[PDB]
Symmetry: C3
Amino acid sequence: TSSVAAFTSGTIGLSSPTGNFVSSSNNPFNGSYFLQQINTMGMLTTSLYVKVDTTTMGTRPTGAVNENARYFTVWVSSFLTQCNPSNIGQGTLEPSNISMTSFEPARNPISPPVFNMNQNIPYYASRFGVLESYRPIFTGSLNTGSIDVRMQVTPVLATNNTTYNLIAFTFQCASAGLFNPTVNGTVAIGPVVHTCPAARAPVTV
Amino acid sequence: TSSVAAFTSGTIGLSSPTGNFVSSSNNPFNGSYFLQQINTMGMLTTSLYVKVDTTTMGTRPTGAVNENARYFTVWVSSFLTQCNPSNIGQGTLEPSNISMTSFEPARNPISPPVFNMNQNIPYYASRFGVLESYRPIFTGSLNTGSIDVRMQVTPVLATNNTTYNLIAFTFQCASAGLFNPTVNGTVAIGPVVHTCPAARAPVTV
Amino acid sequence: TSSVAAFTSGTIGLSSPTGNFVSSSNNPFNGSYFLQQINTMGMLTTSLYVKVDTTTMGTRPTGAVNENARYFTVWVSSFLTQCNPSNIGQGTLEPSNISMTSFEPARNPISPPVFNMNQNIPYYASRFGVLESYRPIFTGSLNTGSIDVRMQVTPVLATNNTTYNLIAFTFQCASAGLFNPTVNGTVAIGPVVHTCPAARAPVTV
């Protein structure tokens, strides 16, 4: 068995808004993504692109509190059926017989707050970990400014009363606009690269 | 065959100014570098050191526009003959029969503006991607302050009119001086480390 | 022999305060750490967690001259018996016959100031290289605010008069409190990830 493994999911051209992301005001929406991870001997490197198109993201409730939200969270999961809040799709594994457990991040020993999926507050704010600064690309009148991303391996309490370790990425826009229904266009960000310890070196199924 | 490969170019001495770098005022200059790259199963990691010695970098013209310039760009290329704006030198491949195409970055899906080499405008500002913060080391009276580095995989229209994907690094100084002919010394920065998706896993020639 | 190798030291529990760290007021103290490193074909990646508990860190002398320190340094070393200022413990190598010399960082060609362990000032400030921003987790009255980490490969003159290359991590707290003996609690930070070139590709003993 290889001491190196890769997982890829999403659309190479950020074309299919199958991701379920949530704004800091608890409004879900849809975005495209491209996720490319490698496990090198127990260290997980995750490369993530995200794109949100106002014409394919869904309904933006009016109201100051809803339109003025600047943050949104994307969950990267290796438990694509048991615990997958953002709906990361099945992808491509290399070697093809490698277990998805090869992309589970190690338990985070700083012990951040649990994301409790049983209380149906769908927004979790990633807060404890590295903050990286990005400038995204726009089209239309949408202008988020620069976006910092907080990255935090987090225990997620599923409805089955068990905790699973996922990576929360919270995108922190400098300016309001993505969630204001009068503002239109697209914002695309990445590659957002995160490194953390994996639960294990790569294992075959 | 190997799922991991390495490319090394430049000199550890940082005293061979063969790099063709360009200030935001469109003034070319000579600088030293040391580039060490690894491809791990389709993920490209780049370590770059840059060093500029005012006595070897070439004539610095006077005038506010030239002397007050704080930004400069270095292009990292895997197409050393066909599209190599900053003159990355032939280097060492491990294993020795691995193809340079193993160090090609994957097309950036956020689609940033193309660098058109045919326009005879040598400076391109890296804008879209991660910004990392460095403190460099100086000698002499030269003092750039801290330097942030923006890192962007970019399509480049080469002089043969094929489009190639390269990595733009724009170094953003806090203080002017590097391009002031009355300010002398050296500045050395690094290791500046970038991760992005490669176009492929490693392949032999 | 593998072109990939791993080293792990410390405890995931972050409750064994055997690390010897030093504040900016030259006061030593004890902390817990969990260090996981990988060498991929000559590229060294370091994941580091640090935790400090006021009940186990040791005596914090009184007086603003001591209590107002916001910075501390942690030395990551591969020379565990000859040059190991923070007392990184023997750990676990994968594969088990791989040399510790596989985790030695390459000499830093920007040539930052040497740390001479034979003289009597224990605090060394990491200055030259990347600065990364983290938010840590607290318990108790302790609040350091956010913490930036400066990461610098550094020549260290050991007490045997040989110079070794090590990695200096200086943790820069936004607020004082950690070294004020009337403030109690814990602070845990990470994963702090650093990449730099290794002195060599992995080699077996």
